[PDB]
Design a protein around this ligand. Sequence first.
Ligand SMILES: CCCC(=O)OC[C@H](COP(=O)(O)O[C@H]1[C@H](O)[C@@H](OP(=O)(O)O)[C@H](OP(=O)(O)O)[C@@H](OP(=O)(O)O)[C@H]1O)O[C@H](O)CCC
Length: 130
Amino acid sequence: GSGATRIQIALKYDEKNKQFAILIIQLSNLSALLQQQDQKVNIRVAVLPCSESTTCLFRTRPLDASDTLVFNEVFWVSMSYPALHQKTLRVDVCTTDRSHLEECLGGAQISLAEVARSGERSTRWYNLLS
Ligand SMILES: CCCC(=O)OC[C@H](COP(=O)(O)O[C@H]1[C@H](O)[C@@H](OP(=O)(O)O)[C@H](OP(=O)(O)O)[C@@H](OP(=O)(O)O)[C@H]1O)O[C@H](O)CCC
């Protein structure tokens, strides 16, 4: 069972509150990305380039590695729609431990230039690249 590890993500812009929502849903074929097992896994979400007025880096809770791994965490970011549209979303799948050191083994980048203003939300799957 070796192919691409994929992450499912929903994105939605809230113009009433001028905020972007990022819903990290789940991982599939995670076995393909890990050599070891039992490992803890979290997702690191970066909204780039990093606007240093607001917070641009986020992290899921860590979970025990499983080939399919559901996180269902939402992160909200304050940002005008024009600002959102210059942005790229970086999400990396990382292992971790009591050291708290991230071992981010692969990720995806998602240009946000075409996020809709409407709030009709976009849910897509993304291949990881290491
Ligand atoms: C960016 C918007 C913010 C937001 O709403 O995100 C909050 C999230 C998801 O909200 P929502 O209720 O709209 O999404 C459901 C969720 O994604 C579940 O996903 P999976 O676990 O991968 O199956 C789905 O069903 P449940 O097992 O009942 O939780 C369900 O998928 P579908 O619609 O059928 O495609 C979703 O309804 O809360 C978490 O689900 C927390 C669970 C209490």
